Amino acid sequence: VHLTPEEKSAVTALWGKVNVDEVGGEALGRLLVVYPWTQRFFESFGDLSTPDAVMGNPKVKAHGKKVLGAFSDGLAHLDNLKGTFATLSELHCDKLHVDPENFRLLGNVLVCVLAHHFGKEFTPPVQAAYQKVVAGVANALAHKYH
């Protein structure tokens, strides 16, 4: 993927209505609740023992902000996602030791969060465009693993 011009416009239009800080915290939080083995990377974040403990965890929210911030910046470069995320790919491999499968899990949780926030506005074609985006971003973040 390979987004169509109509899909790029749809992605950009919806994202203009997104509070990136807020959606970021929500997405990372839900990742850790729905797939709790992903908590393995965040022992230093403190209390993750209940859904509320995770979702309201200040360090989770803070991290979610920086993660979706990087995601947001990448939306300006949909034709070169691999290059855009190359240094973050290398970092997540060499320094953070994060299985790239986690990027796929986060992408699908993000899509759920967008649907939750936007409701009927998150139409099936709009979802399809965002699925291309989160797949591209996950693939790009996985690309420099070795």
């Binding site: 729905v34 859904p51 995770v54 899509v111 649907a115 939750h116 099936p124």
Partner: protein
């Protein structure tokens, strides 16, 4: 395994879906066909575009199977036995596709149930759909 809280959450959320089960089933299928075009390989005999009578009808069948699974949440292997036979011996959908439909069902529920689709309920529904999927692929080999 589904916890007591999971089962409470699934019953509450699906109960709220209520009469919309069939509509939401069809919407999840459409979302799947658009988002994951490889799933269309299982429906070459279908009209898959929006407003499809075949998709609406199939959505109802899928939804009704899920409603039955919720009603028999402690005995899904047996409640779904005939359906798992059909999947194993005839439909023979690759297991990866069940995750794709499950995701699209979650997206559909999130889009329609703002108050109900909490992180905990989200987690429970994902487990539930994974468990249903496991039953439906349990007789493949």
């Amino acid at each position: 395994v589904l916890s007591p809280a999971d089962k409470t959450n699934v019953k509450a959320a699906w109960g709220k879906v209520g009469a919309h089960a069939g509509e939401y089933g069809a919407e999840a299928l459409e979302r799947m066909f658009l988002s994951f075009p490889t799933t269309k390989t299982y429906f070459p005999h279908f009209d898959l575009s929006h407003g499809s009578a075949q998709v609406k009808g199939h959505g109802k069948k899928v939804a009704d199977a899920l409603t039955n699974a919720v009603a028999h949440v402690d005995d899904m292997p047996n409640a779904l036995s005939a359906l798992s036979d059909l999947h194993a011996h005839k439909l023979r959908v690759d297991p990866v596709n069940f995750k794709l439909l499950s995701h699209c069902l979650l997206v559909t529920l999130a889009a329609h149930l703002p108050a109900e689709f909490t992180p905990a309920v989200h987690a429970s529904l994902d487990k539930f759909l994974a468990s249903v999927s496991t039953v439906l692929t349990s007789k493949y080999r």
